[PDB]
Scaffold this active site. Structure first.
Site, mmCIF file in Angstrom:
data_model
loop_
_atom_site.group_PDB
_atom_site.id
_atom_site.type_symbol
_atom_site.label_atom_id
_atom_site.label_comp_id
_atom_site.label_asym_id
_atom_site.label_seq_id
_atom_site.Cartn_x
_atom_site.Cartn_y
_atom_site.Cartn_z
ATOM 1 C CG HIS A 25 -18.790 61.955 -7.680
ATOM 2 N ND1 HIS A 25 -19.500 63.134 -7.699
ATOM 3 C CD2 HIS A 25 -19.648 60.994 -8.099
ATOM 4 C CE1 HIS A 25 -20.746 62.889 -8.054
ATOM 5 N NE2 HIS A 25 -20.862 61.598 -8.308
ATOM 6 C CG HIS A 26 -20.746 57.974 -5.494
ATOM 7 N ND1 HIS A 26 -20.850 59.228 -4.937
ATOM 8 C CD2 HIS A 26 -21.893 57.773 -6.183
ATOM 9 C CE1 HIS A 26 -22.006 59.764 -5.284
ATOM 10 N NE2 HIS A 26 -22.658 58.900 -6.037
ATOM 11 C CB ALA A 27 -14.318 55.160 -5.234
#
Ligand SMILES: [Zn+2]
Ligand SMILES: [Zn+2]
Lengths: 651, 541, 661
Positions: free
Chosen positions: C177-179
């Site tokens: 959930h950070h890409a």
């Protein structure tokens, strides 16, 4: 090959087990005696058939393995039979007096006329020769079901049981009940298992009030009683002062009683969801109970002619889900009321499905916006309960007489608003002050477009002072005036009329301070409008198609100009956004064709929560009922229809 | 404009066609080089080859029960054929294109009612507005193609215009369905609804038709046609005879002979782009991404051969004899059944090496991780012993200074003894000096102990440093070996995954509509009916 | 014993024949995704032997979680390697590698090329590509181990939708959930949740059209928000710390007013904790007040939880106090939300014991248990959390419908920006009152303005007597806007203008000072104005007073005997002046009407006798219901705000006149 973690059996307690169900066919003989034909066309206050219906609706859905619909033991795989037995006299005397028992024991052996006398005297009860044993069976059934829940033989239990018991008082019976069930079960548990059960939470969602159970635990701090019902003090049964919302305990058990009263019938799903999500759940989590008992009742379901409510079988599932979340899982559902068999069947099916393990279904309408009475009622309830509890302080800004001599030192603020208003108008539209001489009033009472003496069409907008929206700071109490907004409500009409090259005249009329009704305001309105007509309008040479727009109050001035003069030669439409105030009547003197003309060309827009429709006469001129409340909302909604009516009135 | 997309077979359809060749090869060889005759034989041969090419669930001589069609996902549906995969890719590209406001319409042409039902089952729930121009529809929705009493005795009724701001309007592309039979029996079916592109699921549409000439006349721009092309098939030969620039029996025979010869054709193409292609097709230009293949060049092929499996070792009897219709059905049924048993057993035996590979992987990972922990601990302990060796160095220095001072006092008092001895006149200075020398010897023994302890501590430090210097090399070696094994581990995992897919395919084929006998042949919901907004997410109006 | 006792000896008749139970939830099992190949991706220990404290994103995590299950009988796999025959409570779901289509549905081709190329780089190339990206490490074996999570998530969600399981746990690493769709970042390689959601929405448009993604991990879901910003089929709710630049990622995209864009307006929501250290109370409050009505209003068809247990108790990166029963309660509510569909994908967690216990509790709730009890249901959430939640409800009321007419926001329409033009019907109230005050003061005693040039503040803030540079005596009233006494309607929020009672308490002093022929300077700092959303009444008052002291007053020729009067919290602005400048040369005294506000701690920065002089020469009235040396002579006034002003007026002016002599 290395066995790192050897096999074992699972470590849980909820759902390797089954759900306890309590039911018996011997609970269907306590019935009334025939008196008059009127019993054939009435909902039969408490009838036996209810029970079997519930049982049947389960068998048709596979949650029970019973082909012949009789009490068996091999109840399948999803449920477990809990046998009943008539309660002993000690379990009953734990709550009631010793004369009530003698009364019922006498009832057992009476004749027929004596039975009729008993049914006639009492506070809405009915006896029968078989009303002793059939009264003893519910108490024992409830005791066994809750016992099974506590000792871990089942997860949670449901008890289809009659006659009900949330109406009978310790002294004497009343309300078609004979013995209290929930109180007896709670007292015998709390005296039997003083190691695991030390606090009990009773919840009542039947639409009547549970005076019996409340009186039982009024002076006790080990049983928290919460009830939702309809009060309507005068008429709605039981109609006493106990059911009121301010009764919050007495003695050592203060603050352990909660009533939630609906001020008017016809509430649905949104009200119950709001009440549960705002009041019941935090109080329940703070009280930290060890057993949750529900005095269920389905006389508030959609399709009932006594409760007259519209609660759908999905709200019951949602409430049961939350209550299952509350305690460690222990939950016993006893059944009390009901008037329409189909609705209680559907509702009982939904509650049973949620008890087995399902999640609740979706509500049919998630956009309902509950009635304005319920919100004020809930705030008032939160006040007292914040005095006693803790989960209502510091979150709803509660934390546990102005003057009458300083009214001469008062910031005016009315003028202030109008002042500001005038400025911007001028600086973008070049309005002009219009003088109403021989009258002591503020100069900026009426402003007109420059060169109004040459326009054909004229729009006259009469309105009171614009509204205010004030933000209430949440940390502590009072209103914050430095972050408030002014909802100007007569700007869009001015802009629409100036973008089509119409003459514009604007009239402001103040509000009388410290008055329930703006009476002097209405008088000032009539005077100013009459003067403005008499000295200015009759003299502009080129004139045709005048149209009035009255916002809120000060429409009385328009109605009075219509009545006490004759102006239908030039004017063509009146529009009035009432809001919530009272209707203004027309009184004609010049003619009555004027009255009919007024009924024809007129538009009045009112709220949905107005006093009417609880059909207005023709002397008010075609009022209409919006679907929202407030001035701003109805204006932003029906501005299109209003401006279309205006534009259609012209060529 | 006409176009062509190369489409090939899948392993399942390859095996089924090998079964059919096994059943049909002998009489065909006899021909080229109420039981039946060779005419009906070749007819059933060609028809069944085409049916297998079009989603082998059509191989059964039945109709889909019209209920399971709206009860199976798109994955399990298109896992059978490759044509359906290509067509689904095409439809998805045409529905999610970059759009102002365009209501572009398309037509889809099948050959019979079976394929049409399969299509309508595939494209049921998508974001289109569809109309089935052939009878007996499947969940007909009613998308129609283009071409307030307040008081008594009053009349205002502004309600109508009210609804003109409330009704939501669709913006979904139109898509019509038809069959070539009903398209040729009647006419004017397409001239009414002005369409833009026709996708012919049939590759032999006979481009010059009356019902299509009227459309090419009435329309404004040029309309593109897209025919899905089987890479090698008994229709691709004729289609190639058309691509350039009585007798049906001989053409049939030549096509089937070419199909038998080119069954094992090595090369087929790939790499079809769809977004640029749908753009080119919609705008009306010559598309170049389409591949120009157009043909493949010409005892030894009469022997059917299936796909070789690891440790399978099966055979085919070739049916060198006569036949009859019911015998045909039963024979094909039991051949498919024995192949099903073999592929089932094949799946259930590759489970064992996977187990051992997983176990070895787990053990190797745990060994690596324990090694890392040991490395950290050893480095920490050496870091701790550093300050102790430093303090020991300090004590050694202190003892050495004491040594030097004591030896200086020794030398001084010894020189004083040397003075006082010659012509003695004996004082107590020699006694005191000897006492001091004894003190010096004592503290010399003490310092010797201390320097010995320092040397021991130094050697312990160095040994621990050596151990920590070896541990890292151990970890690196284990990492290298791990990667070397990881390659083949991933390979075997992927292979067994693909085999599970093929097994599930054959099972679902023979499970449902199945060959003519029942010799071998709801919770839990595998047929996609976990019902949360399914029926109400059908339009239901 | 009894007499009811049905005595009839005959065979009964069948009425309702037996059937299969019409239940769709829990005759089934729960899906669990796990594969031993996901432990391949690991860092490259490069600098020195940092083996002591490893990288927080560690393989063992998965293992530990799995192992905990095997210790509570939920799984019967002894060798701790992924097998099929788990047990009677769960059902293993196979993990397959994702193809190029599914992974290119949201990402771009350049990202795929970059990753598939770094698959077979050298050592130093991997080191450079690790040290270049923002907190992302690459290793020789990273391609397959990154393709596996997306495939696992898609398979789990497909099993949920098709109806082969009840819910699912996807024990999965690396996080996702950070890409962002064009670049990697934050230990993430391929955004798992976005890929999963887009593939469900594409391949199932007959049972799934709206999806609700809830992210309770303590950081912000950058990539998963950016992927569904312009889309109105995916509602993304997130709870996190924000702290504007300190916490990771520290970007404007995580603020609480990023409420959508394009046609996807009102389909995105952030809930930002201002200060770290929250616990069970804040989460329960934000879930009962915000998440659940919005969820019930949106009517989703699938609920995905981008869960992460780095906010649990005993952690170090998150620094919170969430206990394993809060996760159970949140999971219970979310189970209530949809019709039961639920996928739980694992993202965070960096302390093995906390994540182990939390995952155990979440799995127990998923299996069918009810949640446990909270350690303390009397917690009283922090004030800033309450204020932030109210601020969130305001905006979300301007978009959603369940947050107006129930929270008293139906009065005005917040879509129109509060402005001074004729574009919007709304106008701020402060300007009107200030204009009226300016009008009155000017036409009565010729009160001119004082320009605070080179600042962003309204012109008529500081009013002053004319020729203020020649006034031999100056009074300085740093007052604050008045307080109203009216009945605020509770359904709309509009006040009734007929019963309002407002008193201008800050005017009596101005009248008194004019008779004594002393120059007057009035200041009026408002309270946050509702307009800028970052306004601070304390900071702004401090700025105005430092400005007025450094620029103008410090050069007046005939200045002498300057007094100070303070009303409300704005008095603090006075304090921060004296504590930071030597002002004792001309200043004589200071008066304060604190009302019910808490005391002002004076701290000096130049000398220390300032405390003594301030104690000697101050009067600070306070409430009688207050009960509370460096505060400067607090006095417990008798009456009570306006009451202590009207009553102690005479004593205050008498003391001022005596000090002036
Ligand atoms: Zn009742
Ligand atoms: Zn995190």
């Amino acid at each position: 090959r290395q066995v790192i973690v050897p096999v074992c059996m699972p470590k849980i307690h909820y759902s390797p087990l089954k759900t306890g169900l309590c039911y018996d066919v011997r609970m269907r003989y306590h019935a009334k005696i025939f008196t008059s034909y009127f019993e054939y066309i009435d909902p039969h206050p408490e009838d036996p058939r209810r029970i079997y219906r519930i049982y049947k609706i389960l068998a048709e859905n596979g949650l029970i393995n019973d082909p012949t619909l009789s009490g068996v033991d091999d109840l399948g795989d999803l449920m477990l039979k809990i046998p009943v037995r008539a309660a002993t006299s000690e379990e009953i005397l734990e709550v009631h007096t010793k004369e009530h028992l003698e009364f019922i024991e006498s009832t057992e052996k009476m004749s027929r006329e004596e039975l009729l006398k008993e049914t006639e005297k009492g506070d809405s009860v009915y006896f029968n020769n078989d009303s002793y044993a059939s009264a003893r069976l519910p108490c024992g059934g409830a005791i066994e079901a809750c016992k099974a829940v506590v000792e871990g033989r089942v997860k949670n239990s449901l008890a289809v049981v009659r006659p009900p018991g949330h109406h009978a008082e310790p002294q004497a019976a009343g309300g078609f009940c004979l013995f209290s069930n929930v109180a007896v079960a709670a007292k015998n548990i709390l005296k039997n298992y003083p190691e695991s059960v030390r606090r009990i939470m009773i919840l009542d969602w039947d639409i009547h009030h549970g005076n019996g159970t409340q009186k039982s635990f009024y002076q006790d701090d080990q049983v928290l009683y919460v009830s939702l019902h309809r009060f309507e003090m005068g008429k709605y049964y039981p109609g006493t002062i106990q059911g009121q919302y301010d009764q919050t305990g007495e003695g050592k058990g203060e603050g352990f009683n909660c009533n939630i009263t609906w001020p008017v019938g016809g509430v649905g799903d949104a009200e119950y969801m709001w009440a549960f999500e705002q009041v019941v759940m935090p109080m329940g989590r703070e009280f930290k109970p060890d057993l949750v008992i529900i005095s269920s009742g389905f006389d508030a379901a959609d399709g009932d002619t006594i409760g007259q409510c519209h609660v759908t079988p999905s709200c019951y599932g949602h409430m049961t889900h939350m209550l299952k979340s509350l305690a460690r899982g222990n939950l016993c559902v006893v059944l009390e009321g009901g008037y329409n068999l189909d609705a209680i069947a559907r509702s009982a099916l939904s509650v049973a499905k949620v008890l087995i393990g399902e999640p609740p279904d979706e509500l049919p309408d998630p956009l309902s916006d509950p009635k304005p009475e319920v919100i004020e009622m809930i705030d008032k309830v939160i006040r007292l309960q914040s005095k006693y509890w803790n989960c209502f302080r510091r979150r709803h800004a509660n934390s546990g007489p102005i003057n009458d001599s300083i009214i001469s030192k008062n910031f005016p603020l009315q003028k202030a608003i109008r002042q500001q208003q005038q400025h911007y108008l001028s600086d973008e539209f070049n309005f002009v002050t219009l003088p109403l001489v021989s009258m002591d009033l503020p100069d900026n009472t009426v402003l007109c477009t420059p060169n109004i003496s040459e326009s054909n069409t004229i729009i006259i907008v009469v309105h009171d002072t614009s509204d205010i929206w004030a933000k209430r700071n949440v940390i502590s109490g009072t209103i914050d005036l430095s972050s408030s907004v002014i909802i100007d409500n007569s700007l869009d009409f001015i802009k629409w009329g100036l973008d089509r090259k119409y003459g514009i005249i604007d009239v402001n009329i103040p509000l009388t301070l410290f008055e329930p009704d703006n009476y002097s305001g209405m008088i000032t309105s009539q005077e100013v409008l009459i003067y403005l007509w008499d000295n200015y309008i009759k003299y502009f040479p080129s004139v045709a198609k005048i149209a009035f727009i009255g916002i809120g109050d000060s429409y009385s001035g328009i109605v009075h100009l219509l009545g006490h003069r004759d102006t239908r030669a030039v004017t063509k439409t009146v529009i009035n956004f009432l809001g919530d105030k009272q209707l203004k009547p027309l009184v004609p003197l010049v003619d009555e064709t004027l009255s009919e003309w007024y009924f024809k060309n007129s538009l009045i827009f009112s709220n949905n929560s107005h006093q009417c429709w609880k059909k207005p006469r023709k002397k008010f001129g075609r009022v209409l009922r919006c679907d929202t409340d407030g001035l701003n909302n109805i204006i932003e909604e029906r501005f299109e229809e209003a401006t279309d009516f205006i534009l259609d009135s012209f060529e | 404009k006409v176009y062509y997309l190369p489409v090939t077979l899948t392993q399942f359809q390859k095996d089924l066609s090998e079964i059919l060749i096994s059943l049909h090869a002998k009489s065909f060889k006899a021909s080229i080089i109420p039981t039946l005759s060779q005419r009906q034989l070749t007819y059933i041969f060609d028809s069944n080859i085409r049916a297998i090419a079009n989603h082998p669930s059509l191989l059964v001589d039945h109709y889909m029960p019209r209920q399971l069609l709206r009860m199976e996902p798109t994955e399990s549906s298109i896992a059978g054929s490759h044509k359906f995969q290509v067509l689904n890719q095409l439809i998805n590209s045409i529905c999610f294109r970059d759009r102002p406001n365009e209501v572009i319409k398309c037509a889809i042409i099948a050959h019979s009612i079976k394929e049409l039902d399969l299509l309508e089952g595939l494209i049921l729930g998508k974001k289109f507005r569809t109309k089935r121009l052939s009878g007996t529809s499947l969940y007909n929705e009613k998308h129609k193609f283009p071409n307030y009493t307040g008081y008594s005795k009053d009349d205002y009724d502004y309600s109508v215009k009210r609804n003109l701001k409330k009704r939501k309007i669709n913006t979904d592309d139109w898509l019509f369905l038809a069959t070539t039979k009903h398209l040729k029996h009647d006419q004017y079916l397409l001239a009414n609804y002005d369409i833009d592109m026709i996708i012919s699921f049939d590759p032999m549409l006979e481009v010059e038709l009356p019902a299509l000439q009227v459309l090419r006349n009435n329309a404004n721009k040029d309309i593109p046609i897209i025919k899905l092309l089987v890479q090698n098939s008994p229709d691709h030969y004729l289609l190639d005879s058309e691509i350039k620039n009585s007798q049906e029996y001989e053409e049939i025979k030549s096509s089937l002979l070419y199909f038998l010869q080119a069954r094992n054709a090595p090369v087929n193409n790939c790499e079809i782009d769809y977004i640029k292609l749908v753009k080119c097709c919609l705008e009306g230009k010559d598309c170049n991404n389409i591949l120009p293949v157009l043909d493949l060049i010409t005892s030894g092929f009469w022997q059917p051969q299936l796909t070789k499996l690891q440790y399978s070792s099966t055979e085919l009897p070739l049916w060198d004899g006569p036949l009859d219709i019911k015998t045909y059905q039963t024979e094909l049924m039991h051949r498919a059944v024995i192949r099903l048993r073999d592929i089932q057993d094949e799946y259930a035996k590759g489970t064992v090496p996977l187990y051992e590979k997983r176990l070895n992987e787990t053990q190797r990972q745990n060994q690596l991780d324990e090694i890392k922990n040991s490395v950290g601990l050893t480095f920490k302990k050496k870091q701790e012993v550093e300050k102790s060796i430093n303090d020991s160095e300090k004590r050694l220095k202190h003892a050495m200074t004491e040594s030097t001072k004591l030896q200086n006092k020794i030398n001084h008092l010894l020189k004083n003894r040397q003075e006082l001895e010659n012509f003695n006149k004996l004082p107590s200075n020699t006694i005191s000096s000897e006492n001091h020398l004894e003190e010096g010897s004592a503290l010399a023994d003490k310092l010797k102990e201390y320097i010995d302890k320092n040397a021991t501590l130094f050697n312990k430090l160095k040994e621990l440093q050596q151990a920590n210097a070896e541990k890292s090399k151990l970890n690196d070696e284990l990492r290298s070996k791990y990667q070397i094994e990881s390659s083949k581990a991933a390979e075997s995992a992927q292979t067994l995954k693909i085999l599970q897919e093929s097994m599930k395919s054959l099972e679902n084929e023979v499970n449902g509509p199945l060959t003519k006998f029942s010799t071998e042949s709801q919770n839990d919901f595998q047929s996609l009916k976990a019902r949360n907004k399914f029926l109400k997410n059908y339009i239901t109006l």
